Design a protein around this ligand. Structure first.
Ligand SMILES: [Mg+2]
Ligand SMILES: [Zn+2]
Ligand SMILES: [Zn+2]
Ligand SMILES: [Zn+2]
Lengths: 171, 166, 10, 267, 107, 87, 97, 654, 112, 10
DNA sequence: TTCAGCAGCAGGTACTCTTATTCAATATG
RNA sequence: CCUAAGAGUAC
DNA sequence: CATATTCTGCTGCTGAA
């Protein structure tokens, strides 16, 4: 889910970069390094709050190196998927094993085992869809899904969902 | 301490075991402690919009779904540059699944949930998911079970649904 | 003790 | 062995001497907080001599004639006689000198006058005399109130510890008391007006240089005094009835239960 | 303070520690013939109060164990009746500065 | 770390720069000058980084602060500008 | 030439910490080794070309640090490890001074 | 090439946490299991898989990468293996500690003998430091020989409070070599306490019990003192002719295999115990070959085996011989000769030594030109450059590079070039008993094979020129160079903290001459006066008015020597019997830099407190004091050269 | 009084041959030897048994036994001593290392 | 001691 | 109110050079 | 290449 | 016939009269 959390990053600056725009270089290097990133400790990091005055502190010169080590402290918005949490999403793909639903920046793979027996896959339809007697779940279709399993991949977090519970599925 | 290797309970939102660093209270950058405020989808959307517009103003000095998508794309390209596929997807997701519109309604919702005196994660989950009835909301969010009375939850969800706009 | 540090005793 | 034992001793930024564990070895370095290289042997003029010589050297009486000062010594030499507030100032200065004499006799039992102290007051006086061309004939421009208050303010300005609490202030007063005694012994009203004959600017220059030299002589935090002490003890030992020299140093550093010549002194 | 002639039987030493807060200190007459505190090698020892100990640890940023130690068998420590955890201020006539103030904690 | 940092109004350390502080300041500044850092003082033709740093320190144009560590872990931040270089 | 113990002690007395560090590391043996913050041991497999860091046992891949220690120090720590002693190297303080 | 870039964050070690390996931690960190004592396979050309030189532990050849980390020998730190021991053996260095722990804990139920119900146990457990706690607990619980299932009540010794004791009798434990023998009090039965039962009783010790014994729940539990998995160090630890540790590990594996086969095939307890004792002996001698009493495990060649303990300890061990003191680069050593024409802070460096020792100068816009010239000069002429460090890590050698063409220097590169004049260099005479024996000088390149230093600086170094050798170290960075010049410089060391007096002074010929020059009889004519005045480098250019004008202009030696003395120096020393007039010309009076009276000798220009050196360095500065050293040496040496001094047999004849 | 007597003995040793050493060096030595409440010798049994860090304790004597005891007791080495940083090849907190140099953004902008 | 200057003891 | 039984061997700081060798002897593929 | 021994060099 | 193996420097009692 979405939170805002206090994060600190250590940035090393070469001696050549200590011009009057040191603050701007530090702030720009904070961006493009943590903005839109993924980690197992804090989930996704989407954006930084309170950019007007980011706490850069002083910055310590590494001895025998000359590079300065800054501990920049900031507020960051985080989207950490959690086990057994219900969130809305948009279905983007369907397959035999399950269907991939777009939740925020991540894709949740809901397996076919975690749906009521009335909902059945149909690859004959173009695009293939998880179709039921009462409704059809196609591309760009809303669905509320309870995430129950998350595997921590630094490159891109992966999650497994379910809609077996009551009032879980297409809205 | 410094325990080599780690033994801990598996994360579970229903059990409210969000994580060792997602506890109820967190130390702010000022040195004091603040309750871990959890953002619902609308509140998080407003926070993201405020942060992005403030960044755009700083860089300058130094509604329908389609037009909102175009506006967020333009503002995203103006504020930040590349490696924003995740942020673009999150922003379009937020513009899609937004429960509240502007500052007034989100402020009313946040103060009303604050009056409930419930867990920040639970109130954020209440604001995030647009339910219909009381027991349906309880079964949607297992962390809501046996935390507040049925009548009080029903009435507060009635006010939430009244505050639900567009 | 020990020896060293018999026994005690012996 | 000595260097390994003393390797972690260091003077920290609160002037305390601590080891790697933070344990205090000395609350101030050398019990005076001064660098050893800035210390020179100087004579404490109050501890030695006779009472009559001490009074002749220091006592000034503005109301009587036995221990008065020549009015030709200073510009206001004929108007200060009969003054009362200045007499109070002289009385307290001489009382402080007497207290310093008693304290120094309490510290150094043998009455040794030549002891190592940081700032060489004699050389500063000589430099002022050579720089301002004291003619030894013109009456001094200084007023006695100026001399006494300048000495007191200079003592207030000799800061070894910068803390602003009673403990640090008391430790600071303890750390400068011997040098303050030396300063009062040298910069006395009778001595300044008679032996040295300072002018106003010469006296102020002397005060400023004393303050600057004292602040320059303070030990620098980060000084590795343990290794310095170990080497300063070991090197003379390499240069080297009762056992002495290397065997005795071994018996002292290795705390030996039995030694060759256990002697006892009875007075 | 108990003053004895030659020795205390070990069967009597064991009951010397009474019910608190009563502390029994035993001194031998032979050791008390000469006052150790009047030796010129023995500097001035003053027991610090709890408030003074707190102030000393606050101003110098010291822990309990970072102070110099004095044993709870030292003749001066027995003389002044030091108990463990109490700090004695040591006034010493130093030859570099006229007065030096150290502090020793009882162990 | 807020408790670690002593407020500027009650720093109890000397306002003078130690010989070790001066040596490390000169070394750091010379190593930065050698690595193409901007020079804040106008050069009179000197090419040695050490004497460039000496000239910077003489007229107080070194933008560094000394973090002096107390034995308990607390520190004081003394700007090179306000440190008096008497030696 | 041998930079012996008491030459190092002379340099300590001089207060030239950076020159002593340069003598003992840059001039003689400067070894970069990878450790993890879970266990301070040097059992970190670091495929630098592939940009992969992994300490088996701790099952961690994102909590790796690099330190510059003499190769004699690394050999000492490895010999201690062979002698059933763990020299865990931690890059943060767990106790106040 | 050094080490290539690593994305892992760079930190410094803040805390070192010691402890013991758990067997499961060894199994988790080990990248391979060692099962074959042979280090090479039957082909004798490859490292055997599962052997002691398993490629998963590291590559034994430069041509091959490590099979685990896929890195060269330069990068690979070596990854540990593990040998699964058939039966547990005692870690030798912990045996005594084990003997203590098993004597503090009941050998049947695994609980500490004296709980808190004992009055002395509140005192013992309240101790803060773990070592003192364990000492007290041992010295109080070692004499208890019963588990005490029931103890007198703390409130009063009338009723009995029952703890979780078992009531068995603890044995008296001795060590017979590498094994522990327990004698149970007769209801004495002597039997060997098997390592298996000791490990079982150690694994049953409660967390509170062993944390009261000084152990830690996470880092060192007592049962980890018993070896069940031996960590095998990588070939970097035991490089190759196999190393001693390789042979010891081979013997350990041989014993383990023998014990395993004897246990599996079934054998009398005698053979099993013999194999177990052999394994214990091999493990112990692998960790420590200097066990008291036991015969040393001899290497194949009949010499003692060098154990890990032997490698760590001693003068030539790891700590003292490789970490506290190590052999360093950029250092030179040669014979020292005196030079009266060098400054106090100047050291003469042979041209060959200057050509071998090099300094890395960072390419900067301010020094792009001169460095380029040095690169053009090459390494075979002085001044020149030996290497060019590119920003990519490659290193261009000036030898074998003239064929490739001229090198264009870029900012950020390094020019590793011959040390030139005025380079700060550390200079030492060993043993180097004090800090003044290791001081920073300025290089002066000279065309001879000896270090040349001022005569005055030999006194702190305790150096003669009868064959003494001295060492020279060159800083390789700007920070080290700067702190060497600003902290360890020779002028700054003139006054030592050792005795708050100068350590350098006028010595040897310059002293004798300065006594002969400052005599009242010494009169110098115009020509020699002009030469001596010119020999003073900082002479202001005014000829002093002669002491005698008519009938012949004559200057005295004091007048000429006063030129070297800086202006503004006042010195007044009264020797024995001297008055304001000096009939004997003893004492010393100098007013405003002019020697008023007194023969200058060891008390004035020597390493004495209150002398000229001390006054000058405390009034005008260390640089002025060193310049005074130079000026006095030059003038006095010139005068003594043109006056002469000798000694002979007639000087010893009365 | 033991510290004063120890200083007097050391001073007599130093001045027996006429040499002079400043008071502070011998004062530091005798303060180190008497800071534990008793006379601590400069020997394996004296300064090397105080809990001042296993790495700097082992550098003097009895190295391997000190390492074994540290492993058994799970000692924490705070790396405050000179020997710890020498062994680890990092700047010891001595002399120039007793502080940290840091860059000020506001001061650097203030210069230009 | 040591040796030299076993132990003590052994 | 008061005393006899032991036992284990390295040893300052740097540096130069030379010389020997690192099992022999016997059984078996 | 390692180990051991010996001879010395300056303190 | 070639290779595997047989000189200085410290410590802890309690039992029986
Ligand atoms: Mg010689
Ligand atoms: Zn790990
Ligand atoms: Zn490898
Ligand atoms: Zn039991």
């Amino acid at each position: 889910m979405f939170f805002i959390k206090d994060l600190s990053l250590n940035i090393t600056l070469h001696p050549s970069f200590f011009g009057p725009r040191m603050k701007q270089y530090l702030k720009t290097k904070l961006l493009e390094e943590v903005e839109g990133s993924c980690t197992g400790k804090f989930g996704y990091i989407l954006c930084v709050l309170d950019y007007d005055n980011i706490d850069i502190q002083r910055g310590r010169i590494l001895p025998t190196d000359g590079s300065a080590e800054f501990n920049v402290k900031y507020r960051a918005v985080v989207f950490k998927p959690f086990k057994g949490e219900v969130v809305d999403g948009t279905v983007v793909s369907c397959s035999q094993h399950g269907f991939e639903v777009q939740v925020g920046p991540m894709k949740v793979f809901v397996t076919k085992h975690l749906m009521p027996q009335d909902l059945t896959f149909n690859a004959g339809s173009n695009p293939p869809s998880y179709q039921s007697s009462e409704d059809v779940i196609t591309i760009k279709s809303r669905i509320r899904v309870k995430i129950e399993g998350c595997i921590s991949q630094v490159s891109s977090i992966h999650a497994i969902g379910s809609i077996k519970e009551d009032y879980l599925g297409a809205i | 301490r410094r325990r080599l290797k780690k033994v801990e309970e598996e994360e579970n939102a229903a059990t409210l075991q969000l994580g060792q660093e997602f506890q109820l209270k967190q130390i702010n950058h000022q040195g004091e402690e603040e309750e871990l405020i959890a953002l619902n989808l609308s509140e998080a959307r407003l926070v993201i919009k405020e942060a992005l517009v403030e960044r755009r103003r700083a860089f300058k000095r130094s509604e329908t779904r389609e037009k909102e998508l175009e506006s967020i794309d333009v503002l995203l390209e103006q504020t930040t540059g590349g490696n924003n596929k995740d942020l673009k997807n999150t922003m379009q997701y937020l513009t899609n699944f937004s429960r509240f519109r502007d500052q007034e309604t989100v402020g009313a919702v946040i103060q009303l949930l604050k009056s409930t005196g419930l867990h920040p994660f639970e109130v954020a989950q209440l604001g995030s998911l647009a339910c219909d009835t009381a027991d349906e909301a309880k079964t949607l969010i297992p962390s809501l079970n046996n935390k507040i009375s049925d009548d009080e939850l029903e009435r507060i969800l009635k006010e939430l649904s009244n505050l639900e706009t567009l | 003790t020990x020896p060293g540090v018999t026994x005690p005793g012996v | 062995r000595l260097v390994k034992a003393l390797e972690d001793i260091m003077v920290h930024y609160d002037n305390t001497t601590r080891n790697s564990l933070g344990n205090v070895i000395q609350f101030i370095y050398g019990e005076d907080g001064m660098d050893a290289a800035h210390i020179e042997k100087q004579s404490l003029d109050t501890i030695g001599g006779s009472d009559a010589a001490f009074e002749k050297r220091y006592r000034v009486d503005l109301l009587n004639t036995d221990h008065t000062l020549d009015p030709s010594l200073l510009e206001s030499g004929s108007e200060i006689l009969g003054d009362l507030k200045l007499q109070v100032l002289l009385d307290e200065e001489y009382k402080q000198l007497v207290k310093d004499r008693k304290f120094l006799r309490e510290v150094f039992v043998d009455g040794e006058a030549n002891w190592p102290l940081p700032v060489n007051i004699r050389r500063i006086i000589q430099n002022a005399q050579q720089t301002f061309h004291i003619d030894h004939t013109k009456p001094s421009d200084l007023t006695i109130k100026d001399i006494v208050l300048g000495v007191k303010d200079l003592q207030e300005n000799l800061l070894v510890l910068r803390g602003k609490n009673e403990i640090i202030q008391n430790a600071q007063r303890d750390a400068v008391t011997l040098f303050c005694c030396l300063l009062r012994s040298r910069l006395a009203t009778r001595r300044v007006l008679q032996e040295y004959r300072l002018t106003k600017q010469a006296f102020d220059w002397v005060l400023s240089n004393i303050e600057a030299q004292f602040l320059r002589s303070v030990v620098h935090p980060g000084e590795m005094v343990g290794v310095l002490a170990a080497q300063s003890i070991g090197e003379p030992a390499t240069q080297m009835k009762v056992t002495s020299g290397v065997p005795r140093l071994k018996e002292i550093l290795n705390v030996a239960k039995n030694m060759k010549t256990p002697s006892l002194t009875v007075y | 303070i108990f003053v004895y002639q030659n020795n205390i039987t070990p069967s009597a030493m064991k009951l010397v520690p009474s019910i608190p807060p009563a502390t029994i200190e035993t001194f031998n007459e032979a050791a008390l013939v000469v006052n150790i505190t009047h030796h010129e090698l023995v500097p001035k020892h003053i027991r610090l109060s709890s408030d003074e100990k707190r102030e000393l640890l606050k101003r110098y940023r010291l822990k309990e164990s970072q102070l110099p130690r004095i044993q709870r068998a030292d003749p001066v420590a027995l003389y002044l009746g030091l108990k463990r955890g109490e700090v004695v201020k040591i006034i010493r006539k130093s030859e570099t500065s006229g007065r030096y103030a150290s502090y020793r904690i009882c162990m | 770390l807020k408790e670690k940092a002593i407020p500027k109004d009650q720093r109890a350390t000397t306002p003078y720069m130690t010989k070790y502080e001066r040596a490390r300041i000169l070394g750091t500044r010379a190593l930065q000058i050698s690595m193409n850092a901007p020079v804040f003082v106008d050069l009179e033709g000197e090419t040695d980084p050490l004497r460039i740093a000496m000239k910077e320190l003489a007229e107080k144009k070194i933008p560094l602060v000394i973090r002096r560590y107390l034995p308990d872990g607390s520190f004081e931040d003394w700007s090179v500008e306000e440190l008096i270089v008497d030696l | 030439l041998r930079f012996g113990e008491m030459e190092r002690d002379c340099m300590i007395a001089h207060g030239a910490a950076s020159f002593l560090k340069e003598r003992l590391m840059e001039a003689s043996d400067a070894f970069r080794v990878h450790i993890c913050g879970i266990c301070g041991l040097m059992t970190v497999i670091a495929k630098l070309n592939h940009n992969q860091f992994e300490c088996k046992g701790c099952d961690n891949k994102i909590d790796i640090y690099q330190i510059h220690i003499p190769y004699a120090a690394k050999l000492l720590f490895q010999e201690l490890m062979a002698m059933n002693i763990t020299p865990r190297l931690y890059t943060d303080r767990s106790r106040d001074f | 090439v050094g080490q290539q870039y690593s994305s892992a964050p760079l930190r410094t070690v803040k805390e070192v946490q010691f402890g013991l390996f758990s067997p499961e931690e060894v199994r988790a960190i080990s990248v391979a299991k060692i099962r074959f004592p042979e280090t090479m396979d039957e082909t004798q050309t490859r490292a055997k898989i599962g052997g002691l030189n398993d490629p998963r532990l590291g590559s034994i050849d430069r041509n091959l990468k490590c099979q685990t980390c896929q890195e060269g020998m330069n990068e690979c730190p070596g990854h540990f293996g593990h040998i699964d021991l058939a039966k547990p053996v005692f870690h030798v260095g912990f045996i005594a500690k084990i003997k203590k722990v098993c004597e503090c804990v009941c050998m049947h139920c695994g609980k500490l003998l004296l709980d808190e119900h004992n009055e002395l146990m509140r005192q013992a457990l309240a101790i803060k430091d773990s070592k003192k706690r364990f000492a007290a607990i041992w010295t109080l619980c070692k004499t208890k020989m019963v588990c005490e299932t029931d103890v007198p009540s703390e409130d009063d010794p009338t009723q009995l409070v029952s703890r979780g004791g078992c009531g068995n009798t603890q044995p008296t434990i001795r060590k017979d070599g590498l094994k522990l023998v327990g004698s149970w009090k007769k209801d004495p039965e002597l039997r060997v306490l098997s390592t298996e039962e000791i490990l079982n009783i150690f694994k049953h010790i409660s967390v509170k019990d062993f944390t009261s014994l000084g152990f830690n729940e996470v880092f060192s539990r007592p049962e980890w003192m018993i070896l069940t998995c031996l960590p095998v160090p990588p070939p970097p630890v035991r490089p190759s002719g196999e190393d001693d540790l390789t042979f010891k590990l081979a013997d350990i594996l041989k014993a383990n295999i023998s014990l395993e086969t004897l246990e599996h095939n079934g054998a009398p307890h005698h053979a099993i115990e013999e194999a177990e004792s052999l394994l214990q002996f091999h493990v112990a001698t692998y960790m420590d070959n200097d066990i008291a009493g036991q015969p040393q495990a001899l290497q194949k060649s009949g010499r003692p085996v060098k154990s890990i303990r032997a490698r760590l300890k001693g003068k030539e061990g790891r700590i003292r011989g490789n970490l506290m003191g190590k052999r360093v680069d950029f250092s030179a050593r040669t014979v020292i000769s005196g030079d009266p024409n060098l400054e106090l802070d100047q050291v003469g460096v042979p041209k060959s030594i200057a050509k071998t020792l090099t300094y890395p100068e960072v390419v900067t816009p301010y020094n792009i030109d001169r460095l380029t010239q040095l690169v053009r000069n090459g390494p075979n002429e002085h001044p020149g450059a030996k290497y060019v460090i590119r920003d990519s890590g490659d290193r261009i050698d000036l030898r074998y590079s003239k064929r490739a063409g001229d090198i264009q220097l870029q900012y950020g590169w390094k020019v590793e070039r011959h040390i030139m004049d005025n380079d700060p260099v550390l200079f030492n005479r060993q043993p180097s008993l004090h800090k003044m024996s290791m001081m920073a000088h300025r290089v002066k390149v000279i065309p001879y094979s000896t270090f040349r230093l001022n005569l005055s600086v030999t006194s702190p170094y305790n150096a003669d020129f009868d064959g003494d050798e001295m060492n020279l170290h060159v800083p390789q960075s700007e920070e080290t160079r700067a702190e060497l010049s600003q902290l360890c410089a020779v002028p700054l060391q003139i006054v030592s903290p050792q005795s708050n007096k100068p350590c350098m002074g006028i010595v040897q010929d310059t002293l004798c001459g300065i006594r002969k020059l400052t005599l009242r009889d010494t009169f110098i004519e115009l020509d020699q006066v002009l030469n001596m005045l010119y020999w003073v480098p900082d002479w202001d250019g005014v000829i002093p008015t002669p002491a005698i004008i008519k009938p012949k202009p004559l200057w005295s030696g004091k007048q000429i020597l006063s030129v070297a003395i800086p202006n503004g120096i006042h010195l007044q020393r009264f020797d024995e019997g001297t008055t304001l007039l000096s009939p004997k010309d003893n004492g010393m009076l100098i007013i405003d830099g002019q020697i008023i009276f007194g023969v200058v000798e060891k008390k004035t220009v020597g390493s004495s407190n209150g002398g000229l050196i001390h006054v000058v360095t405390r009034e005008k500065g260390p640089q002025v004091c060193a310049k005074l050293f130079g000026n006095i040496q030059k003038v006095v040496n010139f005068w003594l050269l043109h006056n002469g001094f000798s000694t002979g047999i007639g000087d010893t004849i009365a | 009084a033991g510290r004063a007597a120890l200083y007097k003995e050391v001073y007599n040793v130093i001045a027996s041959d006429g040499s002079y050493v400043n008071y502070r060096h011998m004062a530091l030595l005798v303060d180190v030897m008497t800071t534990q409440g008793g006379l601590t010798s400069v020997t394996r049994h004296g300064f090397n048994r105080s809990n001042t860090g296993a790495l700097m304790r082992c550098s003097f004597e009895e190295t391997v036994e000190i390492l074994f005891e540290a492993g058994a007791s799970a000692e924490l080495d705070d790396c405050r001593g000179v020997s710890e940083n020498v062994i680890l090849g990092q700047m010891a907190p001595i002399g120039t290392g007793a502080f940290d140099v840091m860059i000020d953004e506001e001061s650097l902008v203030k210069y230009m």
